[PDB]
Amino acid sequence: MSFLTVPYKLPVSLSVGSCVIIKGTLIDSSINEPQLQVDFYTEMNEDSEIAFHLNVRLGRRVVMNSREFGIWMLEENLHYVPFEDGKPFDLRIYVCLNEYEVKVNGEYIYAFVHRIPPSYVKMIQVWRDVSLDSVLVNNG
Ligand SMILES: OC[C@H]1O[C@@H](O[C@H]2[C@H](O)[C@@H](O)[C@H](O)O[C@@H]2CO)[C@H](O)[C@@H](O)[C@H]1O
């Protein structure tokens, strides 16, 4: 089946216990830009609040933040970058009471404490030059 077209947008409803699962492959083909970006918006509009932002800079860092009232807030940086140019990845973002649990390829890498209640998220966008296999939201 074909890769999803990027930028890829998905309307969503998140609650405690929801799990966002993103599968794809990153390419080392950008210059001064991340190779993957994930944004959780509070409206189906790119000017709305970003409750959760993640971007991947291969070989350098994974960056997480929020954009509240138009402003990028406290940046949280990881120098553990479990993504590899040309290799497939499994990115899982699990909504807990107090944080998102960020998981890559079966490794628990970061807990991002909620700044906006995740019940306010309405749209996920996945973009940059990722070859995107699937994006889904599950719960039980
Ligand atoms: O905080 C996420 C936010 O970062 C912006 O870029 C930052 C960059 O991460 C930092 O290393 C640099 O020192 O400052 C920049 C602020 O302009 C991105 O532009 C933005 O899209 C988010 O990714």
Side-chain angles (χ1 to χ4, degrees):
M1 194 191 89
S2 314
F3 293 138
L4 308 174
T5 304
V6 290
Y8 183 79
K9 284 178 178 57
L10 182 75
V12 303
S13 190
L14 296 189
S15 38
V16 187
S18 312
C19 181
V20 175
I21 309 197
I22 297 166
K23 296 180 173 189
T25 303
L26 301 195
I27 303 310
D28 176 25
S29 55
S30 53
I31 293 103
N32 284 113
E33 301 287 328
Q35 295 86 11
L36 178 59
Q37 185 163 328
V38 183
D39 295 300
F40 295 6
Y41 288 99
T42 58
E43 302 287 338
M44 311 248 285
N45 179 303
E46 291 175 354
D47 297 330
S48 66
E49 325 283 295
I50 301 183
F52 182 67
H53 160 87
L54 179 148
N55 74 75
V56 176
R57 292 148 192 280
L58 286 169
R60 276 77 153 182
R61 54 177 176 143
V62 180
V63 183
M64 287 161 283
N65 206 345
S66 58
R67 203 187 62 196
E68 307 174 51
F69 290 77
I71 302 310
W72 289 110
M73 301 299 279
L74 290 174
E75 193 174 272
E76 279 163 53
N77 289 291
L78 306 175
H79 299 142
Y80 186 63
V81 186
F83 302 84
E84 279 189 281
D85 177 36
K87 294 212 200 153
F89 68 83
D90 195 330
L91 168 58
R92 288 199 186 199
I93 301 158
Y94 181 65
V95 183
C96 304
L97 281 166
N98 189 52
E99 66 270 304
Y100 302 99
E101 298 182 341
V102 179
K103 313 163 178 189
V104 180
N105 296 333
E107 279 190 316
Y108 185 3
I109 70 167
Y110 199 70
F112 185 97
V113 172
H114 293 304
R115 304 167 187 185
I116 291 163
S119 57
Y120 294 170
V121 172
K122 286 183 129 60
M123 180 178 65
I124 299 174
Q125 178 160 234
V126 182
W127 62 297
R128 306 296 177 170
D129 205 18
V130 50
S131 279
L132 200 47
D133 284 293
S134 55
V135 178
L136 44 87
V137 180
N138 270 98
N139 53 75

Short mmCIF file of all heavy atoms in Angstrom, two decimals, residues 75-125:
data_model
loop_
_atom_site.label_atom_id
_atom_site.label_comp_id
_atom_site.label_asym_id
_atom_site.label_seq_id
_atom_site.Cartn_x
_atom_site.Cartn_y
_atom_site.Cartn_z
N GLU A 75 11.49 24.34 26.11
CA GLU A 75 11.96 23.29 25.22
C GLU A 75 12.58 22.16 26.03
O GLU A 75 13.37 22.40 26.95
CB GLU A 75 12.95 23.87 24.23
CG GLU A 75 13.27 22.97 23.07
CD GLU A 75 14.14 23.66 22.06
OE1 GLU A 75 13.59 24.33 21.15
OE2 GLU A 75 15.38 23.56 22.19
N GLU A 76 12.22 20.92 25.69
CA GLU A 76 12.80 19.75 26.34
C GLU A 76 13.56 18.94 25.30
O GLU A 76 12.97 18.49 24.31
CB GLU A 76 11.70 18.93 27.04
CG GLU A 76 11.35 19.54 28.42
CD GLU A 76 10.02 19.06 28.99
OE1 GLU A 76 9.82 17.84 29.08
OE2 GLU A 76 9.19 19.91 29.39
N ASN A 77 14.86 18.77 25.50
CA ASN A 77 15.75 18.18 24.51
C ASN A 77 16.32 16.84 24.99
O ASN A 77 16.77 16.72 26.13
CB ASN A 77 16.91 19.13 24.18
CG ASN A 77 16.46 20.33 23.38
OD1 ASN A 77 16.08 20.21 22.22
ND2 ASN A 77 16.49 21.49 24.01
N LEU A 78 16.31 15.86 24.09
CA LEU A 78 16.95 14.56 24.31
C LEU A 78 18.09 14.41 23.32
O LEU A 78 17.91 14.69 22.13
CB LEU A 78 15.97 13.40 24.11
CG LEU A 78 14.65 13.34 24.85
CD1 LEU A 78 13.83 12.13 24.37
CD2 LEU A 78 14.93 13.27 26.34
N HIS A 79 19.24 13.95 23.80
CA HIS A 79 20.35 13.60 22.92
C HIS A 79 20.40 12.11 22.64
O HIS A 79 21.34 11.64 21.99
CB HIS A 79 21.67 14.10 23.51
CG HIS A 79 21.72 15.59 23.67
ND1 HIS A 79 22.31 16.21 24.76
CD2 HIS A 79 21.22 16.58 22.91
CE1 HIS A 79 22.18 17.51 24.64
NE2 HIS A 79 21.51 17.77 23.53
N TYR A 80 19.40 11.37 23.10
CA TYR A 80 19.17 10.00 22.66
C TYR A 80 18.22 10.05 21.47
O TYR A 80 17.05 10.43 21.61
CB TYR A 80 18.59 9.16 23.80
CG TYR A 80 18.47 7.70 23.46
CD1 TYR A 80 19.59 6.94 23.19
CD2 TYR A 80 17.22 7.07 23.40
CE1 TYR A 80 19.50 5.61 22.88
CE2 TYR A 80 17.11 5.73 23.09
CZ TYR A 80 18.26 5.00 22.83
OH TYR A 80 18.20 3.67 22.50
N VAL A 81 18.72 9.69 20.29
CA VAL A 81 17.94 9.79 19.06
C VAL A 81 17.78 8.39 18.47
O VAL A 81 18.61 7.96 17.65
CB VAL A 81 18.59 10.77 18.07
CG1 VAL A 81 17.70 10.97 16.84
CG2 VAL A 81 18.83 12.10 18.75
N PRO A 82 16.74 7.67 18.85
CA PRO A 82 16.59 6.27 18.44
C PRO A 82 16.09 6.10 17.02
O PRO A 82 15.62 5.02 16.65
CB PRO A 82 15.58 5.70 19.45
CG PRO A 82 15.12 6.87 20.31
CD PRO A 82 15.63 8.14 19.69
N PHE A 83 16.16 7.15 16.21
CA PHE A 83 15.79 7.07 14.81
C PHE A 83 17.05 7.00 13.96
O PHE A 83 18.07 7.61 14.29
CB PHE A 83 14.95 8.29 14.39
CG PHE A 83 13.69 8.49 15.19
CD1 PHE A 83 13.71 9.15 16.40
CD2 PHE A 83 12.46 8.06 14.69
CE1 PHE A 83 12.54 9.35 17.13
CE2 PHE A 83 11.29 8.27 15.40
CZ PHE A 83 11.32 8.92 16.62
N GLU A 84 16.97 6.27 12.86
CA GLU A 84 18.11 6.04 11.97
C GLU A 84 17.67 6.28 10.53
O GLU A 84 16.61 5.81 10.11
CB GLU A 84 18.66 4.62 12.12
CG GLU A 84 19.59 4.41 13.30
CD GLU A 84 20.27 3.04 13.26
OE1 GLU A 84 19.62 2.04 13.63
OE2 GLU A 84 21.45 2.98 12.86
N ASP A 85 18.49 7.01 9.79
CA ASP A 85 18.27 7.26 8.37
C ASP A 85 17.98 5.97 7.61
O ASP A 85 18.78 5.03 7.64
CB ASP A 85 19.51 7.96 7.81
CG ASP A 85 19.43 8.21 6.33
OD1 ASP A 85 18.34 8.51 5.81
OD2 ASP A 85 20.49 8.10 5.67
N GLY A 86 16.82 5.91 6.96
CA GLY A 86 16.46 4.77 6.15
C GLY A 86 15.95 3.55 6.89
O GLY A 86 15.57 2.57 6.24
N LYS A 87 15.93 3.56 8.23
CA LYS A 87 15.41 2.39 8.94
C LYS A 87 14.01 2.66 9.49
O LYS A 87 13.74 3.75 9.99
CB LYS A 87 16.34 1.99 10.09
CG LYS A 87 17.70 1.50 9.64
CD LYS A 87 18.27 0.45 10.59
CE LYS A 87 19.79 0.32 10.43
NZ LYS A 87 20.46 -0.15 11.68
N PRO A 88 13.10 1.69 9.44
CA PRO A 88 11.73 1.94 9.91
C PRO A 88 11.68 2.11 11.42
O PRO A 88 12.51 1.58 12.16
CB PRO A 88 10.97 0.69 9.46
CG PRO A 88 12.01 -0.38 9.38
CD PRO A 88 13.26 0.32 8.91
N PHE A 89 10.68 2.87 11.87
CA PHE A 89 10.53 3.17 13.28
C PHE A 89 9.08 2.99 13.69
O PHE A 89 8.16 3.05 12.87
CB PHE A 89 11.01 4.60 13.63
CG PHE A 89 10.14 5.68 13.05
CD1 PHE A 89 8.97 6.08 13.70
CD2 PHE A 89 10.48 6.29 11.86
CE1 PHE A 89 8.16 7.06 13.16
CE2 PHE A 89 9.69 7.28 11.32
CZ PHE A 89 8.52 7.67 11.97
N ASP A 90 8.89 2.78 14.98
CA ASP A 90 7.57 2.65 15.60
C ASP A 90 7.52 3.66 16.73
O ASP A 90 8.15 3.46 17.77
CB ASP A 90 7.34 1.23 16.12
CG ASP A 90 5.88 0.95 16.42
OD1 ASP A 90 5.14 1.88 16.79
OD2 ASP A 90 5.48 -0.23 16.28
N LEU A 91 6.80 4.76 16.52
CA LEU A 91 6.70 5.83 17.50
C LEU A 91 5.34 5.73 18.18
O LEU A 91 4.31 5.78 17.51
CB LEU A 91 6.86 7.19 16.82
CG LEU A 91 6.51 8.45 17.61
CD1 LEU A 91 7.33 8.56 18.91
CD2 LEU A 91 6.74 9.67 16.72
N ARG A 92 5.35 5.60 19.50
CA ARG A 92 4.13 5.49 20.29
C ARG A 92 4.08 6.62 21.29
O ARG A 92 5.05 6.85 22.02
CB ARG A 92 4.07 4.16 21.05
CG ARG A 92 3.80 2.96 20.19
CD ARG A 92 3.31 1.83 21.07
NE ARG A 92 3.16 0.59 20.34
CZ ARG A 92 2.43 -0.44 20.76
NH1 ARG A 92 1.77 -0.35 21.91
NH2 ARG A 92 2.36 -1.54 20.03
N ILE A 93 2.95 7.31 21.33
CA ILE A 93 2.73 8.41 22.26
C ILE A 93 1.48 8.04 23.06
O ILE A 93 0.37 8.06 22.52
CB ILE A 93 2.60 9.75 21.53
CG1 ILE A 93 3.88 10.03 20.72
CG2 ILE A 93 2.31 10.88 22.52
CD1 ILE A 93 3.73 11.00 19.56
N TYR A 94 1.67 7.74 24.34
CA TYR A 94 0.62 7.23 25.20
C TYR A 94 0.18 8.32 26.17
O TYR A 94 1.02 8.95 26.82
CB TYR A 94 1.10 6.00 25.97
CG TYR A 94 0.06 5.38 26.88
CD1 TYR A 94 -1.09 4.80 26.36
CD2 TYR A 94 0.23 5.38 28.26
CE1 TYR A 94 -2.05 4.24 27.19
CE2 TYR A 94 -0.73 4.82 29.10
CZ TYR A 94 -1.86 4.25 28.55
OH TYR A 94 -2.81 3.68 29.37
N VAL A 95 -1.13 8.53 26.27
CA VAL A 95 -1.69 9.63 27.06
C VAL A 95 -1.95 9.12 28.48
O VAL A 95 -2.90 8.36 28.70
CB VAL A 95 -2.96 10.19 26.42
CG1 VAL A 95 -3.48 11.39 27.22
CG2 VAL A 95 -2.70 10.57 24.97
N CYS A 96 -1.13 9.54 29.44
CA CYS A 96 -1.36 9.24 30.84
C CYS A 96 -2.03 10.41 31.54
O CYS A 96 -2.29 11.46 30.95
CB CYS A 96 -0.06 8.88 31.55
SG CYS A 96 0.78 7.53 30.76
N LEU A 97 -2.31 10.22 32.83
CA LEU A 97 -2.95 11.27 33.63
C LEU A 97 -2.14 12.56 33.61
O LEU A 97 -2.69 13.64 33.38
CB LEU A 97 -3.14 10.79 35.07
CG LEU A 97 -4.32 9.85 35.32
CD1 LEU A 97 -4.17 9.20 36.68
CD2 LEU A 97 -5.64 10.60 35.22
N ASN A 98 -0.83 12.47 33.85
CA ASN A 98 0.00 13.64 34.07
C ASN A 98 0.96 13.95 32.92
O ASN A 98 1.55 15.04 32.91
CB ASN A 98 0.80 13.49 35.37
CG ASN A 98 1.53 14.76 35.77
OD1 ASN A 98 0.94 15.84 35.85
ND2 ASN A 98 2.83 14.64 36.03
N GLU A 99 1.11 13.04 31.95
CA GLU A 99 2.10 13.22 30.89
C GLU A 99 1.76 12.38 29.68
O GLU A 99 0.94 11.45 29.74
CB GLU A 99 3.49 12.83 31.37
CG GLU A 99 3.62 11.37 31.68
CD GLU A 99 3.28 11.08 33.12
OE1 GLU A 99 3.92 11.70 34.00
OE2 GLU A 99 2.38 10.25 33.37
N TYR A 100 2.42 12.69 28.56
CA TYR A 100 2.56 11.75 27.45
C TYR A 100 3.80 10.90 27.69
O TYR A 100 4.87 11.44 28.01
CB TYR A 100 2.73 12.46 26.10
CG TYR A 100 1.61 13.40 25.70
CD1 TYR A 100 1.74 14.77 25.89
CD2 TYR A 100 0.44 12.92 25.10
CE1 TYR A 100 0.71 15.65 25.50
CE2 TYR A 100 -0.59 13.80 24.71
CZ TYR A 100 -0.44 15.15 24.91
OH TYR A 100 -1.45 16.03 24.53
N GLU A 101 3.66 9.60 27.51
CA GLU A 101 4.81 8.70 27.48
C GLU A 101 5.25 8.56 26.03
O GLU A 101 4.45 8.18 25.17
CB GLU A 101 4.45 7.33 28.07
CG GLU A 101 4.02 7.37 29.52
CD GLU A 101 3.71 5.99 30.07
OE1 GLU A 101 3.47 5.06 29.27
OE2 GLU A 101 3.71 5.82 31.31
N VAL A 102 6.51 8.90 25.75
CA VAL A 102 7.04 8.87 24.39
C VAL A 102 7.91 7.63 24.27
O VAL A 102 8.89 7.48 25.02
CB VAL A 102 7.83 10.15 24.06
CG1 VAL A 102 8.40 10.07 22.65
CG2 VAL A 102 6.95 11.37 24.21
N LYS A 103 7.56 6.75 23.32
CA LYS A 103 8.17 5.43 23.15
C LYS A 103 8.56 5.21 21.70
O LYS A 103 7.75 5.44 20.80
CB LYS A 103 7.21 4.33 23.60
CG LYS A 103 6.54 4.58 24.96
CD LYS A 103 5.31 3.70 25.16
CE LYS A 103 4.69 3.93 26.53
NZ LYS A 103 3.61 2.93 26.85
N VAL A 104 9.78 4.73 21.46
CA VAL A 104 10.28 4.51 20.10
C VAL A 104 10.91 3.13 20.02
O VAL A 104 11.85 2.83 20.77
CB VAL A 104 11.31 5.58 19.68
CG1 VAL A 104 11.81 5.29 18.25
CG2 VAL A 104 10.72 6.99 19.76
N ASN A 105 10.42 2.30 19.09
CA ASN A 105 10.99 0.98 18.84
C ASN A 105 11.09 0.15 20.12
O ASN A 105 12.07 -0.56 20.35
CB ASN A 105 12.35 1.08 18.15
CG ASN A 105 12.27 1.70 16.77
OD1 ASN A 105 11.25 1.63 16.10
ND2 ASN A 105 13.37 2.34 16.34
N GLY A 106 10.08 0.26 20.99
CA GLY A 106 10.06 -0.55 22.19
C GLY A 106 10.87 0.00 23.35
O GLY A 106 11.02 -0.70 24.36
N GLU A 107 11.39 1.22 23.23
CA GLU A 107 12.15 1.88 24.28
C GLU A 107 11.35 3.07 24.81
O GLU A 107 10.79 3.85 24.03
CB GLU A 107 13.51 2.36 23.75
CG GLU A 107 14.56 1.27 23.71
CD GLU A 107 15.95 1.82 23.43
OE1 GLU A 107 16.09 2.68 22.53
OE2 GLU A 107 16.91 1.39 24.11
N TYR A 108 11.30 3.19 26.13
CA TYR A 108 10.63 4.30 26.80
C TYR A 108 11.66 5.41 26.92
O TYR A 108 12.66 5.25 27.63
CB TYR A 108 10.11 3.86 28.17
CG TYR A 108 9.29 4.88 28.94
CD1 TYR A 108 8.97 6.13 28.40
CD2 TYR A 108 8.85 4.59 30.22
CE1 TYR A 108 8.23 7.05 29.13
CE2 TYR A 108 8.12 5.50 30.95
CZ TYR A 108 7.81 6.73 30.41
OH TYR A 108 7.09 7.62 31.15
N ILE A 109 11.45 6.53 26.22
CA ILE A 109 12.50 7.53 26.14
C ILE A 109 12.16 8.83 26.85
O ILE A 109 13.08 9.51 27.32
CB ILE A 109 12.93 7.81 24.68
CG1 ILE A 109 11.86 8.54 23.89
CG2 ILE A 109 13.40 6.52 23.99
CD1 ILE A 109 12.34 9.11 22.58
N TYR A 110 10.87 9.19 27.00
CA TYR A 110 10.59 10.47 27.66
C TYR A 110 9.15 10.55 28.15
O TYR A 110 8.23 10.02 27.52
CB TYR A 110 10.85 11.64 26.72
CG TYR A 110 11.02 12.95 27.45
CD1 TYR A 110 12.16 13.18 28.21
CD2 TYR A 110 10.06 13.94 27.39
CE1 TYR A 110 12.34 14.37 28.89
CE2 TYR A 110 10.23 15.14 28.07
CZ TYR A 110 11.38 15.34 28.82
OH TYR A 110 11.57 16.51 29.50
N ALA A 111 8.97 11.27 29.26
CA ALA A 111 7.65 11.60 29.79
C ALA A 111 7.49 13.11 29.70
O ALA A 111 8.20 13.86 30.38
CB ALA A 111 7.50 11.12 31.24
N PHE A 112 6.55 13.56 28.87
CA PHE A 112 6.29 14.98 28.66
C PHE A 112 5.06 15.36 29.49
O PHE A 112 3.93 14.99 29.14
CB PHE A 112 6.07 15.28 27.18
CG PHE A 112 5.92 16.76 26.85
CD1 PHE A 112 7.00 17.51 26.41
CD2 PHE A 112 4.69 17.39 26.97
CE1 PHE A 112 6.86 18.87 26.09
CE2 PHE A 112 4.53 18.74 26.65
CZ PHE A 112 5.62 19.48 26.21
N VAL A 113 5.28 16.09 30.58
CA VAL A 113 4.18 16.47 31.46
C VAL A 113 3.20 17.35 30.70
O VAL A 113 3.61 18.26 29.96
CB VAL A 113 4.73 17.19 32.71
CG1 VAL A 113 3.59 17.78 33.55
CG2 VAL A 113 5.61 16.23 33.53
N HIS A 114 1.91 17.07 30.87
CA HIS A 114 0.88 17.83 30.16
C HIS A 114 0.91 19.29 30.56
O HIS A 114 0.90 19.63 31.75
CB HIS A 114 -0.51 17.27 30.46
CG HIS A 114 -0.74 15.89 29.91
ND1 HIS A 114 -0.59 15.59 28.58
CD2 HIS A 114 -1.12 14.75 30.52
CE1 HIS A 114 -0.85 14.31 28.38
NE2 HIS A 114 -1.18 13.78 29.55
N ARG A 115 0.90 20.15 29.55
CA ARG A 115 0.74 21.58 29.73
C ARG A 115 -0.64 22.06 29.31
O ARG A 115 -1.18 22.97 29.95
CB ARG A 115 1.81 22.32 28.93
CG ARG A 115 3.22 21.86 29.33
CD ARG A 115 4.25 22.36 28.33
NE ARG A 115 5.58 21.83 28.58
CZ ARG A 115 6.66 22.19 27.90
NH1 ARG A 115 6.56 23.09 26.93
NH2 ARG A 115 7.84 21.66 28.19
N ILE A 116 -1.22 21.46 28.28
CA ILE A 116 -2.62 21.66 27.92
C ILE A 116 -3.29 20.31 28.17
O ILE A 116 -2.71 19.27 27.84
CB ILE A 116 -2.77 22.11 26.46
CG1 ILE A 116 -2.22 23.54 26.28
CG2 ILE A 116 -4.23 22.01 25.98
CD1 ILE A 116 -1.94 23.91 24.83
N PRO A 117 -4.49 20.27 28.75
CA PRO A 117 -5.17 18.98 28.93
C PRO A 117 -5.30 18.25 27.61
O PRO A 117 -5.75 18.83 26.61
CB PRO A 117 -6.54 19.38 29.50
CG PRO A 117 -6.29 20.71 30.16
CD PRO A 117 -5.27 21.39 29.30
N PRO A 118 -4.88 16.99 27.54
CA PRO A 118 -4.95 16.27 26.26
C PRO A 118 -6.37 16.09 25.76
O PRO A 118 -6.55 15.78 24.57
CB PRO A 118 -4.28 14.92 26.57
CG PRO A 118 -4.32 14.79 28.06
CD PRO A 118 -4.24 16.19 28.60
N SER A 119 -7.38 16.28 26.60
CA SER A 119 -8.76 16.25 26.14
C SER A 119 -9.08 17.38 25.17
O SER A 119 -10.16 17.35 24.56
CB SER A 119 -9.72 16.29 27.33
OG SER A 119 -9.50 17.45 28.13
N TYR A 120 -8.20 18.37 25.03
CA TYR A 120 -8.42 19.49 24.13
C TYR A 120 -7.82 19.28 22.75
O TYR A 120 -8.04 20.12 21.86
CB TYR A 120 -7.85 20.79 24.72
CG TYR A 120 -8.54 21.25 25.98
CD1 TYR A 120 -8.02 22.28 26.75
CD2 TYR A 120 -9.73 20.65 26.40
CE1 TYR A 120 -8.65 22.70 27.91
CE2 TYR A 120 -10.36 21.05 27.57
CZ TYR A 120 -9.82 22.08 28.32
OH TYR A 120 -10.44 22.50 29.47
N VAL A 121 -7.08 18.20 22.54
CA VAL A 121 -6.46 17.94 21.24
C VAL A 121 -7.52 17.51 20.24
O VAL A 121 -8.35 16.64 20.52
CB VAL A 121 -5.35 16.89 21.38
CG1 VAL A 121 -4.81 16.48 20.00
CG2 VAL A 121 -4.21 17.42 22.27
N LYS A 122 -7.50 18.11 19.05
CA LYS A 122 -8.46 17.77 18.01
C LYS A 122 -7.82 17.34 16.70
O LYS A 122 -8.52 16.76 15.86
CB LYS A 122 -9.41 18.94 17.74
CG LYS A 122 -10.45 19.14 18.85
CD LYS A 122 -11.41 20.28 18.48
CE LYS A 122 -12.87 19.87 18.62
NZ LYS A 122 -13.24 19.46 20.02
N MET A 123 -6.53 17.57 16.50
CA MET A 123 -5.92 17.23 15.22
C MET A 123 -4.45 16.91 15.44
O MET A 123 -3.76 17.61 16.18
CB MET A 123 -6.08 18.37 14.20
CG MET A 123 -5.46 18.08 12.83
SD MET A 123 -5.70 19.41 11.61
CE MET A 123 -4.78 20.77 12.32
N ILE A 124 -3.99 15.86 14.77
CA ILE A 124 -2.57 15.53 14.75
C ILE A 124 -2.07 15.75 13.33
O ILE A 124 -2.74 15.40 12.36
CB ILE A 124 -2.34 14.08 15.21
CG1 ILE A 124 -2.85 13.93 16.65
CG2 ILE A 124 -0.87 13.70 15.09
CD1 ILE A 124 -2.81 12.51 17.20
N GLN A 125 -0.90 16.38 13.21
CA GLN A 125 -0.24 16.51 11.92
C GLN A 125 1.14 15.87 12.00
O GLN A 125 1.89 16.11 12.96
CB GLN A 125 -0.11 17.98 11.51
CG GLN A 125 0.62 18.16 10.19
CD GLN A 125 0.34 19.50 9.53
OE1 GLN A 125 -0.08 19.55 8.37
NE2 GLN A 125 0.58 20.59 10.25
#
